[PDB]
């Protein structure tokens, strides 16, 4: 029911070193489907509002794509294949309108799907995803700065916040569940 797969890079904006994942999705995917794959690779919980911003190749205008309300394009309707091409390869995804997480979505390759492979898949990634509610790029980096100093006044509060086992550099693509 689809032939090709989109090889996408997803990067959290504003944090360095870069937190990223590479996933392959069915070409017939809607934006809703993609929202869910993003939530999956980032280990997010879908608590908050989201939206995509992308140039529409048929118009050259910037479309906003998100949940069905009654100027907004419906993500259940909008197909990736109507927007992503090789000369229109990037989208912006915002999740959490308080913390304002932004994921860059870049199409790198469109390829025939592989026999027996169950899509979507996560092929690679670097770094732990930002935890939910962690205060945006600024809030998360402040916590990581604290972590570098076990004598910091709020070191113990930061450990409690992020948990004992938290490792900012831990990611394994086989932990992702779509």
Residue 144 belongs to domain with CATH number: 3.10.290.30
Q: Per the structure, how many domains does the chain have?
A: 1
Specify the length of the chain in residues. 178
Tokens matching residue 11: 């990067």
| Residue pair 84/57 in contact by the 8 Å Cβ criterion | no
The resolution, in angstroms to one decimal, equals 2.3
Q: How far is CA 20 from the centre of its chain?
A: 8
Give the structural domain span for 14.
1-178
- 144 CB-near residues (< 8 Å, 6+ apart): 168
Pick left, alpha or beta for residue 9 (phi over 0 → left; psi -120 to 50 → alpha; otherwise beta).
beta
121 preceded by a cis bond (ω within 30 of 0): no
Q: Give dist(CA 6, CA 44) in Å, integer.
A: 22
Tokens matching residue 170: 């831990």
How many C-beta neighbours within 10 Å does residue 26 have? 17
Q: Give dist(CA 8, CA 84) in Å, integer.
A: 10
Task: List the one residue out of 159, 139, 134, 108 whose CA is nearest residue 43.
Answer: 134
Q: Give dist(CA 6, CA 169) in Å, integer.
A: 26
Per residue, the 3-state secondary structure of the chain, as one string, reads: CCCEEEEEEEEECCCCCCCEEEEEEECCCEHHHHHHHHHHHCCCCCCCCEEEEEECCCCCCEEEEECCCCCEEECCCCEHHHHCECCECEEEEEECCCCCEEEEEEEEEEEECCCCCCCCEEEEEECCCCCCCCCHHHHHHHHHHHHCCCCCCCHHHHHHHHCCCCCCCCCCHHHCCC
């Amino acid at each position: 029911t689809f032939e090709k797969v989109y090889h996408l890079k997803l990067s959290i904006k504003g944090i360095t070193p870069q937190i990223w994942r590479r996933i392959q999705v069915p070409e017939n995917y809607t934006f809703l489907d993609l929202h869910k794959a993003i939530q999956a690779v980032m280990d997010w919980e879908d608590y908050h509002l989201h939206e995509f911003e992308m140039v529409n190749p048929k118009t050259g205008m910037l479309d906003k794509i998100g949940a069905e309300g009654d100027p907004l394009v419906s993500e259940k309707k909008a197909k990736l294949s109507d927007y992503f091409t090789l000369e229109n390869k990037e989208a912006l995804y915002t999740y959490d309108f308080g913390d304002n997480w932004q994921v860059k979505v870049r199409l790198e390759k469109i390829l025939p799907r592989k026999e027996g492979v169950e899509y979507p898949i996560c092929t690679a990634g670097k770094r732990a995803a930002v935890p939910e509610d962690s205060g945006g790029v600024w809030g998360y980096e402040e916590m990581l700065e604290v972590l570098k100093d076990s004598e910091h006044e709020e070191y113990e509060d930061t450990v409690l916040w992020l948990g004992d086992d938290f490792d900012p550099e831990y990611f394994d693509p086989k932990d992702v569940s779509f």
